[PDB]
């Protein structure tokens, strides 16, 4: 079964949730969320109505844009 | 037949953000060349810069791709 890496983020103000998981390719947004445990840690999250976006990277520049998409361009390296 | 999109370029001294209307069906690359951002910032390199796409709303049924970050928001304000 092909494996991909995904992240889930949720900003519990003054202690952020930010976790990466290895998952079976084919998993949906709802399945990743419900299988992570995030809903047990934060029982105030309501998937029927909570607002959810996805940050995708890397992408192919040939991908088709949709309403409300933001393209973020940034630098891989710091310094001065 | 149009859609509203944004393009941002984050660098150390400034955050650039611009909103555009473009033809439904446009690719990321066409949007970038169309925006004139590459003339404005000659240092942007399409093979070297990080480039990602933020999408919202999604669907709970969307199939995840490699490197997708699901962001769950707390209701405002």
Swiss-Prot record, chain B:
- Specify the superkingdom: Bacteria
Residues spanning the signal sequence: none
Q: Which family does it belong to?
A: Belongs to the UPF0125 (RnfH) family.
What this protein is called in its record is Protein RnfH
The species this protein belongs to is Haemophilus influenzae (strain 86-028NP)
Give the gene symbol: rnfH
């Amino acid at each position: 079964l092909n494996q991909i890496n995904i992240e889930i983020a949720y900003a519990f103000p003054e202690r952020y949730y930010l976790k990466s998981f290895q998952v079976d390719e084919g998993i949906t947004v709802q399945t990743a969320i419900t299988q992570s445990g995030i809903l047990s840690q934060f029982p105030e999250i309501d998937l029927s109505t909570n607002k959810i976006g996805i940050f995708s990277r890397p992408i192919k520049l040939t991908d088709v844009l949709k309403e409300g998409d933001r393209i973020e361009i940034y630098r891989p390296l710091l310094a001065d």
